[PDB]
Swiss-Prot record:
It is found in: Secreted. Residues 109-129 are annotated as: Disordered. Ca(2+) binds at D15, D34, T35. This is Nuclease A. Residues 109-125 have a biased composition (Basic and acidic residues). The active site is at R29, E37, R75. It comes from the Bacteria. The chain holds residues 89 to 223 of 231 of the full protein.
Length: 129
């Protein structure tokens, strides 16, 4: 896989971020995780965590996997990186997202994220508490 540039337009919630990619605006949905909706327990915390991470970053990148690049709603499906740190990993490691929506052929970083989830779960962090 390869990283490509993008720029923040707007943090939306824990696992969706509006970004300018190839010069066009689009809502990205993070591959391989599920954050709580804003109205659910840990939702505002998840939104807050993603917001800070993307807003504070000097450099945002997107990394499509080997399969589907858009979902049925027109959202882009990618891993997102903030100054080289994967957003998914950071969220999962903090117990603010679950590994989720693991579909065949768009699952390259599954085991990395599972490892992080196991460590969050061990520490009984946030969703795991
Ligand atoms: C993460 C992801 C979600 N989706 C779709 C499945 C879910 O369909 P349904 O809306 O029909 O439940 C929806 C969940 O996204 P949200 O968690 O953003 O709601 O997004 C994909 O199709 N591919 C993906 O990689
Ligand atoms: Ca969600």
């Amino acid at each position: 896989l390869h990283k490509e540039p993008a720029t923040l337009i707007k943090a939306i919630d824990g696992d969706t971020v509006k970004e300018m990619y190839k010069g066009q605006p689009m809502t990205f949905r993070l591959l391989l995780v599920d954050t709580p909706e804003f109205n659910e327990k840990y939702g505002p915390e998840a939104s807050a965590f993603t917001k800070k991470m993307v807003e504070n970053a000097k450099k945002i990148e997107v990394e499509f996997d080997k399969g589907q690049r858009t979902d049925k709603y027109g959202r882009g499906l990618a891993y997102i990186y903030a100054d080289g740190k994967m957003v998914e990993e950071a969220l999962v490691r903090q117990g603010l997202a679950k590994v989720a929506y693991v579909y065949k052929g768009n699952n390259t970083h599954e085991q990395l994220l599972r490892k992080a989830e196991a460590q969050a779960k061990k520490e009984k962090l946030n969703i795991w508490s």
